[PDB]
Structure 1
Amino acid sequence: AFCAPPAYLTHQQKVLRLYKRALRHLESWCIHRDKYRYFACLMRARFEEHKNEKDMMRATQLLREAEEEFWQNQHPQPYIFPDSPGGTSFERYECYKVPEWCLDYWHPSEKAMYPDYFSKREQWKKLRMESWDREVKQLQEETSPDGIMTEALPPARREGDLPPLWWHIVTRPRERP
């Protein structure tokens, strides 16, 4: 979620990802932990086996074969963590994640009940404004002369500088509001 994806997965990434998928599905069939441990070690035997085959034209043919084998022995209903995509708690609290900007419409009589939270907030709104100009400038200075771009972002290279485009990450609502 935090890291933007690359342009394309390498062979190394496509095999590790399969490895994790194939174990999680094994655990879905086995259930029992002792039985899940036994077959998880057999699974690693099948991945250590062709670990070094560096043909790079049969390694691929060993992956498409293994994905087509995974897709046939899927669990029709794998276990999912409650907060993960497809999970039962997935996005349960998204109705409680009010953006911080909604406080900017609060009535004064509402703001009068939290005088010290609302004072540590005008500092953050100042810090955000003074930092903005220097953030925009830094992002042009690192705009590579060749258009090739990636979703990643640069840090603060100086002192007294916050990393550019930091407000929507730092201020984001809590995972469990």
Structure 2
Amino acid sequence: KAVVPFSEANKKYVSSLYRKSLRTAHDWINKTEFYRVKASEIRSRFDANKHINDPNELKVIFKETEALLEDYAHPDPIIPPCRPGGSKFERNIPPRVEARIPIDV
């Protein structure tokens, strides 16, 4: 679908793209003081393109952004233990609560 800047569906696409940018920075950079420098550099690059009207510019930028995010993706991201993909995910799931149906077998 075409991109309409300043729309609600554009404030969710850029926001998610910014999340994946910062998470990828966090996976690669494991020191908090070093992460803040990279986190601000990423944000300033978002601020530069913040005021753009032409969708024909945004789609060129949006396609390029995913090229960088996919290229810089960490092969081993950081996942919380109980989240999907974590070390404790689906461990000791409580059983389903439902009355047993008796059968004659």
Q: TM exceeds 0.5?
A: yes
For 2:43, the aligned partner's letter is R
For 1:53, the aligned partner's letter is I
Question: 1:82, 1:90 within 8 Å by CA — same for their partners in 2?
Answer: yes
Question: 1:30, 1:36 within 8 Å by CA — same for their partners in 2?
Answer: yes
1:98 match: 95
Identity of aligned residues (%): 29
Indicate the SS of the match to 1:76.
coil
Supply the RMSD in Å over aligned alpha carbons: 1.6
1:78 match: 77
Q: Say whether 1:41 aligns with 2:40.
A: yes
CA distance, structure 2, for counterparts of residue 18 and residue 85 of structure 1: 20
1:122-152 Cα distance to aligned partner (Å, 9 max, x none): xxxxxxxxxxxxxxxxxxxxxxxxxxxxxxx
1:22 match: 21
Structure 1: segments with no counterpart, 5+ residues: 1-8, 106-177
2:31 match: 32
TM-score (norm 1): 0.49
Q: Say whether 1:10 aligns with 2:35.
A: no
- Following superposition of structure 1 onto structure 2, how do residues 1-177 of structure 1 map, counting pairs within 5 Å? 10-94=9-93, 97-101=94-98, 104-105=99-100
Structure 2: segments with no counterpart, 5+ residues: 1-7, 101-105
How many residue pairs get aligned? The number is: 93
Indicate the SS of the match to 2:55.
coil
Higher RCO, 1 or 2 (CA under 8 Å, sep at least 6)? 2
- Asked which structure has the greater CA Rg, the reply is 1
Mean Cα deviation higher: 12-21 or 35-44: 12-21
